[PDB]
């Protein structure tokens, strides 16, 4: 049996750690809800 536990409020936080890149990717989405890279 799965259970839930509160972890926080949903808030924008100024001077959060700013990271990650912004890749543009050709993808396909199959009937099972799995994305794949189209090449």
């Amino acid at each position: 049996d799965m259970y839930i536990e509160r972890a926080g409020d949903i808030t924008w936080e100024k001077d959060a750690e700013v990271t990650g890149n912004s890749p543009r990717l050709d993808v396909a989405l199959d009937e099972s809800g799995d994305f794949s890279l189209v090449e």
């Binding site: 049996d1 259970y3 839930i4 509160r6 972890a7 926080g8 409020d9 990650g20 990717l25 809800g33």
Partner: protein, 156 residues
């Protein structure tokens, strides 16, 4: 049980100790997660039961106690924040400019941040704190790293 808005861990005891299988969003009395976290099963909050109301394996989304409530959309320009809730670790905001998933049916925001699979369902926010979608469904890239769609449901 607990019906306050905010972000929640999704846990199981069916494995060793207590294992975090993902995360969700409680808004307007509705619990919002990704389908691959719960596989559509019921959930416990305290002594209370949360029953599935709506889901779609292809969208990889599921709502509990009521219909999908989250309707905000990435502007296609601005940074966003992943409210990551990793297993055993505190909720942490990570701010990023999303990339783009190009598909035959349209472009979708994408976030290139690496977290364990148990982080699936963590909400992605705009500058006003609105949930513009959930983290946890995407693709493994050349680097071995994971890039998640910004997955948003429809509100009726």
């Amino acid at each position: 049980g607990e019906t306050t808005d905010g972000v929640y861990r999704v846990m199981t005891r069916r494995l060793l100790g207590s294992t975090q299988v993902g995360v969700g969003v409680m808004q307007e009395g509705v619990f919002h997660t990704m389908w691959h976290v719960t596989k559509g099963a019921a959930l416990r909050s305290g002594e209370g039961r949360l029953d599935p109301y709506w889901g779609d394996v292809k969208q990889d989304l599921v709502s509990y106690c009521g219909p999908w409530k989250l309707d905000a959309a990435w502007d296609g320009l601005s940074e966003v924040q992943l409210l990551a809730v990793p297993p055993g670790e505190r909720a942490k905001n990570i701010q990023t400019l999303p990339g783009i998933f190009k598909t035959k049916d349209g472009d979708i925001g994408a976030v290139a941040l690496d977290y364990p699979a148990g982080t699936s369902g963590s909400p992605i926010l705009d500058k006003c704190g609105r949930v513009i979608g959930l983290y946890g469904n995407g693709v493994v890239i050349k680097n071995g790293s994971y890039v998640s769609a910004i997955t948003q449901g429809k509100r009726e």
